[PDB]
Write a protein that binds this DNA or RNA. Structure first.
Lengths: 74, 81, 73, 109, 93, 95, 94, 82, 93, 109
DNA sequence: GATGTATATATCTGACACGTGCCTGGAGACTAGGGAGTAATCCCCTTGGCGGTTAAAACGCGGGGGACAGCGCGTACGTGCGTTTAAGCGGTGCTAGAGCTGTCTACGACCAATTGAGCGGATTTGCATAACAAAGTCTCC
DNA sequence: GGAGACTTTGTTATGCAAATCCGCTCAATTGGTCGTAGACAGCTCTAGCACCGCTTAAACGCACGTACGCGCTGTCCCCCGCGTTTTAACCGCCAAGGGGATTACTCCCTAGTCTCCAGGCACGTGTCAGATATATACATC
């Protein structure tokens, strides 16, 4: 079981896919730096739909896997 | 004990020199630097030992080192005092 | 009975977690909300350890009423 | 001075955070004089408090510059060496684990 | 076994200056050495002034003179003002 | 790929100026302290804090010496530090 | 005529052997008073206070010139320049 | 009011001090740098001598105030009291 | 108005080391500054040692330790030997 | 030393320096609450030793310069030409002391 | 051959070395009360050793950059010389302020009883860090 | 042909050290009595300021020439940086025991007082070691 996306992640794969389509063969470290900066510059209103999607994904994830426990290890 | 002065290796000397902003080091620095370090230590240790002895102790403590340094005009903060 | 207490606290923490997730809140929000309601603000470290029951029985019992209020609000 | 103080301790009357009674004791003890006047520990406690506050303020600002919420020996060293009056006052002081300032001569670039 | 320090007062000052900043234990050890060192220098000079002028008493006047001799610039000036004010408040009703 | 000489030296200067750890390895420093101490008096013991205090002071001393040594070399129109730049710094200083 | 440097060496020996003050006394007193006046007006000085200041000042400057001279030698010069004075002061810690 | 007595330290005063110190040749800019140095030394010594004088509530600076001012800076002076 | 100095004692020492040598008054002024300076440093360090070890008494042991910390080289050895004899003889005389 | 036959303490100790005065100066001056009996004896002996050492060297300097009397200059030469005294007195300024006749070789013809 | 320094005389002067008489701090003898010294006990922190991992030190090599020596200009310093300034000395005079004494009172030491601030040792709680979601591009096993 | 590195933010868990709490001790706070250190007023009379006039030694300005600072070129040493081998630092754990801190007694040493009196100090004499000036000869440039 994989983790749910947070607001940045919902937004960034939407925008990462866009970046990859507009500029294919672009390294993701460039895309990621640009996406990071754009996210930081967004307003709460602009982030809001990704925040709401992230909230829904977390609730759905829990319902799908009520016994999921995140267990990272060194 | 003998010859533990050589335990101050070339890379130790260089790292100290870099911290001080030195860009290039000639080959004779290493010996000169060791001579300087040794003198500094003998003077600090001798006084720390003297305080230790006065008090009739056998273990040199942090405070004996701190006073030895204070007298040379090198006040040290953070080890007691 | 310590076991009866343990079960009550386990059930509470589980209900707290379920509501927190269902409603879309983070551990950070539980912490901040309690600060506003009670004057006692908790970090997410505390909330995590509480949910994970890594805290003492006394702390869980003392914090529980604040968390019960959090669930209700 | 400050508008008021009613509590019983001397530090409260003097409007200080530093102890006064302790300072008095320390002045009486290691043979500084036969006598210590009443205003001596008050005046001195106020001075120590003032200087303490300046270092902490500057060190706290250094902590924020590094985006930290805590003062560590390094922050104390930077606070002192980037302030001329403190740098003179503490010019001979070695601060354990304080580090050095990032001074690189331009001629080396 | 009891050892005194100024750790509690240093903390109290830090709170007023920077309400959300903490301090490490090593940093506190340094602050304690700082206070002890300043204390001895001022007390030491004040003692010498009393000796020089053939007095047996250290008063706020020697402490003030000792502060001016030891602290530089404006640091000395502000310290003098704070000391003067604390004494004034202390003796006032 | 290679870097031109001096590139690395500048990286090291920034790196060491930023960090706070001790540069001299601890066990050989410790033995040096003991060797010296034996000449003054036999059978002494040291607290671990005494050794750390000596080490901290020794490095602070040597670092300060290198800063002054470096100024002397610059004055002489050199980059490389030589034994005589150390000796001049010590003499002016008064050691 | 003597070659340059013959006289300078003569003078170095002469001044090293004697003990008298080199700065003229009245000019020195006015300098002392001018400075003192900025700190506090209407001060008086004992004649022995001025002599103590003058002996200290010359001792200071002579010592500075000795270190200054070493710096100039290090740089392979005979002539002392403002930078040699500044380097000596910096190393000393002023 | 006194002013500009810094010029009372004439070039030969500077040269003679430099020669006693073993200097063989002197740059033309030494004279000004030397005066700046002397003045700073005097201000620090005088300021402390005055401070001791005021503390004692006197208006006359004595040899002892100068001697303590110098002792304090690490320069013990012998022969004027101590 | 009465002052004290060591000019008598300095003079007496001079005649033991150099029976036909005199001393100027300025040279004597220097010897008095010297004696007062050494006295203060030794007494000062001995005071500190007593404080450090939490004692209230200065004895010949503190003076001896202070001498070793302050005098260099062989001055320390000869000074210690002479001090030891003076105390030994005094005690038995 | 073999003996003394006098009422003074300096005589008993075989010293020329006063003992009673040293004791008085140690008691006054706030060095300690108490001064031990041997403290002024030991200390007077040390001051005498150092005094004798300087005068002997200064006297030799006076004879080398063909004089019968010690002046401040001889005291300066005696100190500066002796390493151990020079360290002890390294920061001392002697009024009218003069300097040693040091000329750098690079300045010579 | 010219310009400076040390050495062979005669005289006198400020500076020192000696002797009286007057205290006033130094030494002798008692007593009491704390301080430092001794012996006996506990147990904390120091030394010393052991084996294993692996991060730093040691070694060699080749190549470029910097120390160094030599040369040639050009200007900034030293050294004389004559004129000008202000220091240094002696003399006269005034008066602020250092230095001393003598009364007298507000100040701080000391003691004994009381009580809340601060100390250590537990116990709560936050900082600081790091793993992982998505996704495509590129690298290495 | 397959794993993993690489990048972004935000939410989760986790190691360690820092912030906070409890109960008890003991150093800080009252309140009163005692003695003397230092504040204050008044007096003597030292020595620090100010001015004036004369001599004269040192400072000032300017002309002249050359010794030294500075920039440039070119050569050859020797220090940097890389990759490979080897070595000793560092980490845990363990045991043994020596020395540091504490406690409770004991006796000796130093402060304090009072008494007595001769070693040290201002003040006045008495003698001379080296500066000051002249004249001779040699050292250094």
């Amino acid at each position: 079981v994989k983790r749910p996306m947070n607001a940045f992640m919902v937004w960034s794969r939407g925008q990462r896919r866009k970046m990859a389509q507009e500029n294919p063969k672009m390294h993701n470290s460039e895309i990621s730096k640009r996406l990071g900066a754009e996210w930081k510059l967004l307003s709460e209103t602009e982030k809001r739909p990704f925040i709401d999607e992230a909230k829904r994904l977390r609730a759905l994830h829990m319902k799908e896997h009520p016994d999921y426990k995140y267990r990272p290890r060194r | 004990l003998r010859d533990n002065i050589q335990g101050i290796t070339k890379p130790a000397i260089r790292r100290l020199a870099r911290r001080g902003g030195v860009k290039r080091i000639s080959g004779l620095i290493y010996e000169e630097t060791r001579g300087v370090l040794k003198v500094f230590l003998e003077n600090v240790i001798r006084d720390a030992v003297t305080y230790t002895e006065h008090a009739k102790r056998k273990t040199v403590t942090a405070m004996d080192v701190v006073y030895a340094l204070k007298r040379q005009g090198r006040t040290l903060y953070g080890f007691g005092g | 009975d310590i076991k009866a207490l343990q079960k009550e606290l386990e059930q509470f923490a589980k209900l707290l977690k379920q509501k927190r997730i269902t409603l879309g809140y983070t551990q950070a929000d539980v912490g901040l909300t309690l600060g506003v309601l009670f004057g006692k603000v908790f970090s997410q470290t505390t909330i995590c350890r509480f949910e994970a029951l890594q805290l003492s029985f006394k702390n869980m019992c003392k914090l529980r009423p604040l968390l019960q209020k959090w669930v209700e609000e | 001075g400050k508008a008021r103080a009613k509590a019983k301790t001397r530090s409260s009357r003097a409007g200080l955070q530093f102890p006064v009674g302790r300072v008095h004791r320390l002045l009486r003890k290691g043979n500084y004089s036969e006598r210590v006047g009443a205003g001596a520990p008050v005046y001195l406690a106020a001075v120590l408090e003032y200087l303490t506050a300046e270092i902490l303020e500057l060190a706290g600002n250094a902590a924020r510059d590094n985006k930290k919420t805590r003062i560590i020996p390094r922050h104390l060293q930077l606070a002192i060496r980037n302030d001329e009056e403190l740098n003179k006052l503490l010019g001979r002081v070695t601060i354990a684990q304080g580090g050095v300032l990032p001074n690189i001569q331009a001629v080396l670039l | 076994s009891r050892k005194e320090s100024y750790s509690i007062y240093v903390y109290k000052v830090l709170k007023q200056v920077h309400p959300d900043t903490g301090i490490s234990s090593k940093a506190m050890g340094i602050m304690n050495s700082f206070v002890n060192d300043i204390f001895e220098r001022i007390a030491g000079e004040a003692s010498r002034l009393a000796h020089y002028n053939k007095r047996s008493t250290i008063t706020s006047r020697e402490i003030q003179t000792a502060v001016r001799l030891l602290l530089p610039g404006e640091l000395a000036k502000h310290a003098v003002s704070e000391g003067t004010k604390a004494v004034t408040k202390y003796t006032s009703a | 790929h290679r870097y031109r000489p001096g590139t690395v030296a500048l990286r090291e200067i920034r790196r060491y100026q930023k960090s706070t750890e001790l540069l001299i390895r601890k066990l050989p420093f410790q033995r040096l302290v003991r060797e010296i101490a034996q000449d003054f008096k036999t059978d002494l013991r040291f607290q671990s804090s005494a050794v750390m205090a000596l080490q901290e002071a020794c490095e602070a001393y040597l670092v300060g010496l290198f800063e002054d040594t470096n100024l002397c070399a610059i004055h002489a129109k050199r980059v490389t530090i030589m034994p005589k730049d150390i000796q001049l710094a010590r003499r002016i200083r008064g050691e």
